[PDB]
Motif scaffolding. Structure first.
Motif, PDB file in Angstrom:
ATOM      1  N   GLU A   1       0.795  -1.221   0.000  1.00 36.07           N
ATOM      2  CA  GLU A   1       0.000   0.000   0.000  1.00 36.07           C
ATOM      3  C   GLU A   1       0.831   1.276   0.000  1.00 36.07           C
ATOM      4  OE1 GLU A   1      -2.996  -0.271   3.013  1.00 36.07           O
ATOM      5  OE2 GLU A   1      -2.542  -2.360   3.521  1.00 36.07           O
ATOM      6  N   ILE A   2       2.074   1.229   0.486  1.00 38.82           N
ATOM      7  CA  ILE A   2       2.875   2.446   0.599  1.00 38.82           C
ATOM      8  C   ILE A   2       3.224   3.011  -0.771  1.00 38.82           C
ATOM      9  CG2 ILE A   2       3.775   1.880   2.886  1.00 38.82           C
ATOM     10  CD1 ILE A   2       6.332   0.844   1.454  1.00 38.82           C
ATOM     11  N   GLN A   3       3.258   2.166  -1.804  1.00 39.05           N
ATOM     12  CA  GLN A   3       3.628   2.636  -3.134  1.00 39.05           C
ATOM     13  C   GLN A   3       2.559   3.538  -3.732  1.00 39.05           C
ATOM     14  OE1 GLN A   3       6.568   2.136  -3.932  1.00 39.05           O
ATOM     15  NE2 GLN A   3       7.297   0.062  -3.483  1.00 39.05           N
ATOM     16  N   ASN A   4       1.300   3.306  -3.383  1.00 38.84           N
ATOM     17  CA  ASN A   4       0.195   4.078  -3.928  1.00 38.84           C
ATOM     18  C   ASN A   4       0.493   5.575  -3.843  1.00 38.84           C
ATOM     19  OD1 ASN A   4      -1.222   1.410  -3.770  1.00 38.84           O
ATOM     20  ND2 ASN A   4      -3.020   2.696  -4.174  1.00 38.84           N
ATOM     21  N   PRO A   5       0.397   6.320  -4.949  1.00 40.45           N
ATOM     22  CA  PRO A   5       0.428   7.787  -4.838  1.00 40.45           C
ATOM     23  C   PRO A   5      -0.659   8.333  -3.937  1.00 40.45           C
ATOM     24  CG  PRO A   5       0.727   7.123  -7.116  1.00 40.45           C
ATOM     25  CD  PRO A   5       0.359   5.879  -6.357  1.00 40.45           C
TER      26      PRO A   5
ATOM     27  N   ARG B   1      12.311   4.933   0.415  1.00 39.67           N
ATOM     28  CA  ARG B   1      13.564   4.763  -0.312  1.00 39.67           C
ATOM     29  C   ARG B   1      14.390   3.622   0.269  1.00 39.67           C
ATOM     30  NH1 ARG B   1      16.125   9.965  -3.301  1.00 39.67           N
ATOM     31  NH2 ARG B   1      14.187  10.274  -4.475  1.00 39.67           N
ATOM     32  N   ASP B   2      14.724   3.724   1.556  1.00 39.79           N
ATOM     33  CA  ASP B   2      15.682   2.800   2.149  1.00 39.79           C
ATOM     34  C   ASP B   2      15.142   1.377   2.203  1.00 39.79           C
ATOM     35  OD1 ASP B   2      17.011   5.160   2.438  1.00 39.79           O
ATOM     36  OD2 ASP B   2      17.416   4.944   4.583  1.00 39.79           O
ATOM     37  N   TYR B   3      13.822   1.210   2.266  1.00 32.61           N
ATOM     38  CA  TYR B   3      13.249  -0.124   2.396  1.00 32.61           C
ATOM     39  C   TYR B   3      13.066  -0.805   1.044  1.00 32.61           C
ATOM     40  CZ  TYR B   3       9.963  -3.858   3.488  1.00 32.61           C
ATOM     41  OH  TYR B   3       9.339  -5.078   3.602  1.00 32.61           O
ATOM     42  N   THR B   4      12.402  -0.135   0.101  1.00 31.64           N
ATOM     43  CA  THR B   4      12.151  -0.731  -1.205  1.00 31.64           C
ATOM     44  C   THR B   4      13.327  -0.578  -2.160  1.00 31.64           C
ATOM     45  OG1 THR B   4      11.187   1.263  -2.202  1.00 31.64           O
ATOM     46  CG2 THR B   4       9.717  -0.159  -0.913  1.00 31.64           C
ATOM     47  N   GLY B   5      14.202   0.397  -1.928  1.00 36.24           N
ATOM     48  CA  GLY B   5      15.200   0.759  -2.908  1.00 36.24           C
ATOM     49  C   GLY B   5      14.675   1.617  -4.038  1.00 36.24           C
ATOM     50  N   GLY B   6      13.408   2.006  -3.994  1.00 33.78           N
ATOM     51  CA  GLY B   6      12.791   2.861  -4.989  1.00 33.78           C
ATOM     52  C   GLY B   6      12.685   4.291  -4.507  1.00 33.78           C
ATOM     53  N   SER B   7      11.586   4.947  -4.874  1.00 29.58           N
ATOM     54  CA  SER B   7      11.411   6.353  -4.546  1.00 29.58           C
ATOM     55  C   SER B   7       9.938   6.718  -4.655  1.00 29.58           C
ATOM     56  CB  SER B   7      12.255   7.244  -5.462  1.00 29.58           C
ATOM     57  OG  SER B   7      12.066   8.609  -5.144  1.00 29.58           O
ATOM     58  N   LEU B   8       9.578   7.819  -3.999  1.00 34.88           N
ATOM     59  CA  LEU B   8       8.227   8.369  -4.068  1.00 34.88           C
ATOM     60  C   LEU B   8       7.229   7.434  -3.390  1.00 34.88           C
ATOM     61  CD1 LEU B   8       6.683  10.306  -7.014  1.00 34.88           C
ATOM     62  CD2 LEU B   8       5.330   8.508  -5.911  1.00 34.88           C
TER      63      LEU B   8
END
Ligand SMILES: O=c1ccn([C@@H]2O[C@H](COP(=O)(O)OP(=O)(O)O[C@H]3O[C@H](CO)[C@@H](O)[C@H](O)[C@H]3F)[C@@H](O)[C@H]2O)c(=O)[nH]1
Ligand SMILES: [Mn+2]
Length: 542
Positions: free
Chosen positions: A159-163, A535-542
């Motif tokens: 769910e955290i990825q959802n804009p 960032r630090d958990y998924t390695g992604g952003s936003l």
């Protein structure tokens, strides 16, 4: 400048009706106040308070007596008399500078700030208060929060990825994990603290961290001993060796913030009051700096595009750009100036050679034994800078405020905690009990302490202000100024308290370190933090 005489009030409050018993008591209380042989401020204040109370008795029983117009005017004169008593028998506050750093290693930056006060006020005795048993509290808090952050991200990974994701859902779920981990520690603490081995707080934290957070005992011990060494070499004085805690109740309050909540600012709120009570002097947060000479920059005109607070920040940045008293101080705002302004600052700053031509010396800070003086911010008092003689009347009022506030808190919170429910269900039990005691007088206080358990871990959790912080001072000021006791509803604000202001030329509050709070954070900070966590958990952003 005395009050009206009894004879004057007899004429002003004349009635065709006979003199009520309550009125004869006012006249005696007024007469005896006027004939006081003493010069003791507290004695005069208490007689004034007795008089004021006796006027209220009359006015509330005879709400129609014609006497009330002159009695109301007397009440206004009594308020002025309080200020006159306060501004009498003034002398320099004890020449102590009190700082507090609890819960871990005092930072080099903090010591640089303290150095500025030391450089400028060599005659003041500096006391940097610390807790010799509690250098691992900040380490524990960080370990709890970081582990809880990971658990919450895992749980919300999809769910955290959802804009559209409200980051408050992360903070609420993380808070559930934080609360459980705090309970785990506290219960272990309770199992150890009464052993005949008499372990210290840090003994217990170290064992808990080694066994539950995969930490290294010798590394923790090195941090502990180095923190002790560092603070002792930099004006350090142990709260546990100086009988600041003169009763169990104050130790319990300090301990519940230090241990159960991990709120070092609240713990510091308690220590500073006891230090001023016992020693007197000036208390300063470690992010406070000396005041700038009143006229150092009078020749420089603030552009209309820059607000007043940002201009105060710029003056400090300018001083530090050219004197570098503080290693690498920010120049974020000064660098944006028009060149002519930067050059005008450089001219003045470099024309001065002694640090005390840039900053103001405290010298004698004249105060009476009744008062405490306090800094202001954004229209309210802020207890990041204080002045008080030892044993002052107002300091004792603040301490009683704090104790009464925690009494109410703990009456409703202790049953909730002892239920061992999770964070959500514990909060409900706390709230249900709390709000069933609501009145018009206390409703604001109740609403402000309802999110107590969230303080330090969720955005805009600010209960500390109304418990150990400014709110307790503001109500104590109301009590003092209006000759009341145990005020919970009304708080006096900056505009009411010019008589109690920390002198403006003796304090620079708008420092680089002050911009950020170490026990709380706002919504923009919550967003910034959440983005970094993602960032630090998924390695992604936003
Ligand atoms: O790890 C830590 C973190 C902080 N402290 C203590 O808490 C004091 C204030 O922390 P800080 O300036 O970062 O938070 P702030 O939001 O400005 O505090 C206000 O609100 C605070 C709570 O009422 C009040 O204490 C403060 O005067 C107000 F300005 C700091 O100077 C230390 O004495 C600590 O001892 N160890
Ligand atoms: Mn601060």
């Amino acid at each position: 400048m005395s009050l009206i005489s009894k004879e004057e009030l007899i004429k002003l409050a004349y009635s065709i009706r006979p003199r009520e018993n309550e009125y004869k008591t006012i006249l005696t209380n007024l007469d005896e106040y006027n004939k006081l042989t003493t010069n003791n401020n507290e004695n005069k204040y208490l007689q004034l308070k007795k008089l004021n109370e006796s006027i209220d008795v009359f006015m509330n029983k005879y709400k129609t007596s014609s006497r009330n117009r002159a009695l109301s005017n007397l009440k206004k004169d009594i308020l002025k008399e309080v200020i006159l008593i306060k501004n009498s028998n003034t002398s320099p506050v004890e020449k102590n500078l009190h700082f507090v750093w609890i819960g871990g290693e005092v930072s080099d930056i903090a010591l640089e700030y303290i150095k500025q006060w030391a450089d400028i006020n060599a005659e003041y005795n500096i006391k940097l208060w610390y807790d010799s048993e509690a250098f691992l509290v900040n380490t524990l808090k960080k370990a709890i929060v970081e582990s809880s952050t990971t658990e919450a991200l895992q749980l919300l990974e999809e769910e955290i990825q959802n804009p559209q994701f409200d980051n408050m859902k992360f903070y609420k779920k993380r808070m559930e994990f934080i609360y459980d981990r705090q309970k785990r520690f506290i219960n272990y603490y309770k199992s150890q603290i009464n052993k005949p081995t008499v372990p210290t707080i840090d003994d217990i934290i170290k064992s808990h961290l080694v066994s539950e957070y995969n930490r290294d005992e010798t590394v923790l011990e090195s941090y502990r001993t180095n923190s002790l060494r560092k603070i002792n070499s930099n004006h350090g004085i142990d709260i546990r060796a100086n009988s600041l805690f003169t009763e169990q109740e104050l130790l319990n309050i300090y301990s519940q913030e230090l241990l159960n909540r991990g709120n070092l600012a609240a713990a510091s709120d308690i220590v500073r009051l006891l230090a001023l009570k016992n020693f007197g002097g000036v208390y300063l947060d470690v992010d406070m700096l000396p005041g700038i000479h009143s006229d150092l920059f009078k020749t420089i005109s603030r552009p209309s595009s820059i607000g007043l607070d940002r201009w105060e920040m710029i003056k400090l940045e300018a001083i530090m750009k050219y004197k570098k008293y503080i290693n690498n101080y920010t120049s974020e705002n000064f660098d944006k100036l028009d060149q002519q302004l930067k050059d005008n600052f450089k001219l003045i700053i470099e024309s001065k050679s002694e640090k005390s031509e840039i900053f103001s010396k405290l010298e004698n800070l004249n105060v009476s034994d009744l008062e405490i003086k306090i800094a202001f911010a954004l229209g309210s008092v802020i207890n990041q800078a204080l002045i008080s003689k030892q044993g002052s009347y107002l300091t004792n009022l603040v301490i009683e405020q704090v104790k009464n506030r925690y009494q109410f808190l703990n009456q409703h919170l202790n049953p909730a905690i002892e239920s061992d429910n999770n964070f959500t269900d514990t909060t409900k039990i706390f709230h249900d009990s709390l709000f069933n005691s609501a009145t018009a007088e206390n409703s604001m206080f109740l609403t402000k302490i309802a999110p107590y358990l969230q303080v330090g871990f969720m955005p805009e959790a600010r209960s500390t202000i109304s418990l150990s912080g400014p709110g307790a001072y503001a109500s104590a000021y109301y009590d003092f100024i209006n000759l009341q006791e145990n005020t919970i509803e009304k708080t006096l604000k900056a505009s009411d308290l010019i008589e109690f202001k920390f002198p403006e030329n003796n304090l620079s509050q708008l420092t680089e370190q002050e911009i950020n709070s170490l026990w709380s954070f706002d919504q923009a900070s919550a967003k910034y933090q959440f983005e970094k966590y993602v960032r630090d958990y998924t390695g992604g952003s936003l």
